[PDB]
Amino acid sequence: SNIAFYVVSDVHGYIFPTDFTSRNQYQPMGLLLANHVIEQDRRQYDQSFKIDNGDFLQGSPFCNYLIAHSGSSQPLVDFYNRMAFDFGTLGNHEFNYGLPYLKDTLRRLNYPVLCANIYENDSTLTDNGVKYFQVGDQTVGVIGLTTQFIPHWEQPEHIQSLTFHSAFEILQQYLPEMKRHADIIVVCYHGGFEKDLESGTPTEVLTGENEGYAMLEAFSKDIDIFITGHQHRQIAERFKQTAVIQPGTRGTTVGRVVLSTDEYENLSVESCELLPVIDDSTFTIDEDDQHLRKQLEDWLDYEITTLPYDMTINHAFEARVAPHPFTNFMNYALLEKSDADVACTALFDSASGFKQVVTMRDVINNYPFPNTFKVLAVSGAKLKEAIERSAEYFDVKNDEVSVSADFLEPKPQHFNYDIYGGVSYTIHVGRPKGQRVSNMMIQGHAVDLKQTYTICVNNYRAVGGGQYDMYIDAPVVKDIQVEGAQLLIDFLSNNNLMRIPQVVDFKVEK
Numbered sequence: 001s002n003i004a005f006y007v008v009s010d011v012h013g014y015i016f017p018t019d020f021t022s023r024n025q026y027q028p029m030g031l032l033l034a035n036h037v038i039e040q041d042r043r044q045y046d047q048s049f050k051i052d053n054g055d056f057l058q059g060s061p062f063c064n065y066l067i068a069h070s071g072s073s074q075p076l077v078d079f080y081n082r083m084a085f086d087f088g089t090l091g092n093h094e095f096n097y098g099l100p101y102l103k104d105t106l107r108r109l110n111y112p113v114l115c116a117n118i119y120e121n122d123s124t125l126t127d128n129g130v131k132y133f134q135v136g137d138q139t140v141g142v143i144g145l146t147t148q149f150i151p152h153w154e155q156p157e158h159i160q161s162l163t164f165h166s167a168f169e170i171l172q173q174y175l176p177e178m179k180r181h182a183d184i185i186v187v188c189y190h191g192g193f194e195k196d197l198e199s200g201t202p203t204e205v206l207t208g209e210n211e212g213y214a215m216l217e218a219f220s221k222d223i224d225i226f227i228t229g230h231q232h233r234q235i236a237e238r239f240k241q242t243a244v245i246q247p248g249t250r251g252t253t254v255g256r257v258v259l260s261t262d263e264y265e266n267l268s269v270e271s272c273e274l275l276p277v278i279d280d281s282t283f284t285i286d287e288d289d290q291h292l293r294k295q296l297e298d299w300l301d302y303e304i305t306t307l308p309y310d311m312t313i314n315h316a317f318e319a320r321v322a323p324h325p326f327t328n329f330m331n332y333a334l335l336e337k338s339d340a341d342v343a344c345t346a347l348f349d350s351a352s353g354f355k356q357v358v359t360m361r362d363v364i365n366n367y368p369f370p371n372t373f374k375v376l377a378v379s380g381a382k383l384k385e386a387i388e389r390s391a392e393y394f395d396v397k398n399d400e401v402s403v404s405a406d407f408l409e410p411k412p413q414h415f416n417y418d419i420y421g422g423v424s425y426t427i428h429v430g431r432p433k434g435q436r437v438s439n440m441m442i443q444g445h446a447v448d449l450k451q452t453y454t455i456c457v458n459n460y461r462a463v464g465g466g467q468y469d470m471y472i473d474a475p476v477v478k479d480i481q482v483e484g485a486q487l488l489i490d491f492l493s494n495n496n497l498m499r500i501p502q503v504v505d506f507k508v509e510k
């Protein structure tokens, strides 16, 4: 006898088979197609469960569209509700629009979301943290856990009443009970691994963001299935006897773990792997779904404005290693809105700059996060520290400047490299981290390390996101409650002639 567990994670609102780079795109991804793979595959097993492991409420242009129209998650929830999931977990992105929007969403889902380590006042935010069920005369126990690092990323107003506890500690505290109650333990953690599964060597700074390895080295013998996410990696292997799974992102793959009984009648892991999501001749999309997609594409094709000249980004790396007209433009927009001495922004992975005709699609692709902004008062010394952190993005390989492995593995984080405007500087990649920034000047004046300056950063940075801890608790000079996308749209609307002065002036070399 057997049971299959199917898991999707970090779907990020990618429901349709497209990443929205162009209107007619179709590619083997998204929840509709991932779910079709599961429905076809599950028929071979005696029984099966379907699980979503977090980061489902934000990410894609579809989510941007919902916020800009109904303001409700119902159209997204509808897709999830017709698929008959058994349970899910909370990812960090479920808090991006505030606690009331999340609570409303959980009420509308027709399955439970399990989170044992996030508390609201004196009890768990979600109704439950653990769930048990039977498979023959055996009991399965499932515990849902989420990365504790949320306060380093989210707007304070969105999480003020919450308490985030270590996933390792809550698991440890629940194991005794779960071991008494169940024969099989499933842990669903919206977090990943801070050390390599085989070597055990750290693969990132041990901040507590990711605790999966610690959880496995300490409790593997009692954990039968370890479902993970957050890092967007594709992992399907065994840690000792534990089946470990991480099924990527955007419905590109589906995780499947199968358990089967012995003659003794005890359940044991039979297989653990990732199933690829592929197109096939039986897959169809309902007419109502196709109609929703059309509304979405028409909205993305909405023309914002026409520019006199082009500002396309051909090679993203080239626009990070030296000033580019598009990064100069975004920084100028921030300096004009904020009135700060300095401003900064990352060049996101999906940014392609602007062409002469700018549509809603291009705007979203250049700034696809719902970040607002803050002007912080920082000393000249703290500013240098911030530039030094960004300079860690580079490394020297084969005698030339390249992107550091730290910022590419195990997950790309181009969003953690900032390009600064209002300040000129030199980065010397061949020098030790922490002492790579030179020639800092602000308006024909060397940066006085003891003088106070103002810098406009996004809210993610303001709370230390991306290891920019020098901004935590800096005095807030101004809270700009306008998201990045709209801030650009407003700028385009008011600056017809697009006479943009040069505010980005820096260079990167050995």
Ligand SMILES: O=C(O)CCC(=O)C(=O)O
Pocket (backbone or CB within 6 Å): 153, 369, 371, 415, 458, 460, 465
């Ligand atoms: O919002 C940002 O700038 C950081 C991006 C982020 O939070 C993520 O990709 O997980």
Ligand SMILES: [Mn+2]
Pocket (backbone or CB within 6 Å): 055, 091, 092, 093, 190, 229, 230, 231
């Ligand atoms: Mn996540």
Ligand SMILES: [Zn+2]
Pocket (backbone or CB within 6 Å): 010, 055, 091, 093, 230, 231, 232
């Ligand atoms: Zn994610």
